[PDB]
From Swiss-Prot:
Protein known as: Ribosomal RNA small subunit methyltransferase A
Protein's cellular compartments: Cytoplasm
Described purpose of this protein according to its UniProt entry: Specifically dimethylates two adjacent adenosines (A1518 and A1519) in the loop of a conserved hairpin near the 3'-end of 16S rRNA in the 30S particle. May play a critical role in biogenesis of 30S subunits.
Gene: rsmA
Lineage, uppermost ranks: Bacteria, Bacillati, Bacillota, Bacilli, Bacillales
Organism: Bacillus subtilis (strain 168)
Sorted UniProt keywords: Cytoplasm, Methyltransferase, RNA-binding, rRNA processing, S-adenosyl-L-methionine, Transferase
InterPro entries attached to this UniProt entry: KsgA/Erm, rRNA_Ade_diMease-like_C, rRNA_Ade_Mease_Trfase_CS, rRNA_Ade_methylase_Trfase_N, rRNA_adenine_dimethylase, SAM-dependent_MTases_sf
Length: 234
C-alpha cells in the first residue's frame, strides 16, 4: 500500500494477484502489451516481465501521477488517446518490433465497444484479457466469432482500495459475404421488440425462415443460428 495522497477510479492493492493476471497473459520478455486504463499498478509488475508496454489513458489527471509512478521502468510509454478513437494499428507499427496481448481495465458502458474495435480491424494480437465485474463474466460472450473465452481466475473486493461491494473477475480471449456484422447490428436495434421490427430498421423485403420463429427476439438466437440468416442475400 504505497498508494499515497493528490486526492482520495478505484484501484487494486496487492501484487499477489497481478502476476496471476500476468500469468494468464501469455506474457514474456518476447511479447509486448497494450495496457488500457492504467491508474496507478498493473502496468508496473507488467513492465517487470514484458518486452514493452503501451498504456492507453483518456484521463489527463493520471499523467503527472504516471510521470513519477512507473517512471523508473524504462520499457513503458503512456500514449494519451481515446482508445475507442485511437490509432492502435498505427501504434503497433510505431512501438513493437513480438506477440502482443492487450490487458484492459474498462467500465461496462464502453468496455464492450472497445473490445470490438480492437478485434474488428483484424489486428494481429495473441489475445484480449479484460477485468470486469463478477456478475458480467459469469453471464456466459457477445461475439464468440472472433474469439472463444475462458473466465479464468476470480478477483475479490478484498484486494481493492475503495473496496467496491461486488467482487470482480478476469476473462482472457485468445483469438483464432460478412454483412453478417451489419446483420447483428440491425437485429438488436429495438432490443425488446419482435424480429419484424428490428429488420425494419435495416437497409431495404421477402424472407422465408430457415427453421426459425418470426416473432422470436434478438438475444435468443444461437451464434451458429445467426450465421444461417445472414446467408439470405449477402
Amino acid at each position: 500500500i504505497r498508494t499515497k495522497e493528490y486526492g482520495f477510479q478505484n484501484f487494486l492493492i496487492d501484487t499477489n494477484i497481478l502476476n496471476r493476471i500476468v500469468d494468464h497473459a501469455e506474457v514474456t520478455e518476447k511479447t509486448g502489451v497494450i495496457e488500457i486504463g492504467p491508474g496507478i499498478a498493473l502496468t508496473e509488475q507488467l513492465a517487470k516481465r514484458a518486452k514493452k508496454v503501451v498504456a492507453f489513458e483518456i484521463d489527463q489527471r493520471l499523467l503527472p501521477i504516471l510521470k513519477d509512478t512507473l517512471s523508473p521502468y524504462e520499457n513503458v510509454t503512456v500514449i494519451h488517446q481515446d482508445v475507442l478513437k485511437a490509432d492502435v494499428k498505427s501504434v503497433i507499427e510505431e512501438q513493437f518490433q513480438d506477440e502482443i496481448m492487450v490487458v484492459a481495465n474498462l467500465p461496462y458502458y464502453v468496455t464492450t465497444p472497445i473490445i470490438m474495435k480492437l478485434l474488428e480491424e483484424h489486428l494481429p494480437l495473441k489475445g484480449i484479457v479484460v477485468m470486469l465485474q463478477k456478475e458480467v463474466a459469469e453471464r456466459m460472450i457477445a461475439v464468440q466469432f472472433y474469439t472463444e473465452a475462458k473466465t479464468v481466475m476470480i478477483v475479490p473486493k478484498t484486494v481493492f482500495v475503495p473496496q467496491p461491494n461486488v467482487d470482480s473477475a478476469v476473462i482472457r480471449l485468445i483469438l483464432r459475404e460478412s454483412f453478417f456484422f451489419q446483420l447483428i447490428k440491425a437485429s438488436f436495434a429495438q432490443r425488446r421488440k419482435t424480429l419484424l421490427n428490428n429488420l425494419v430498421n435495416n437497409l431495404p423485403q421477402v424472407l422465408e425462415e430457415t427453421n426459425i420463429d418470426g416473432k422470436r427476439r434478438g438475444e435468443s438466437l444461437s451464434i451458429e443460428e445467426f450465421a444461417a440468416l445472414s446467408n439470405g442475400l449477402y
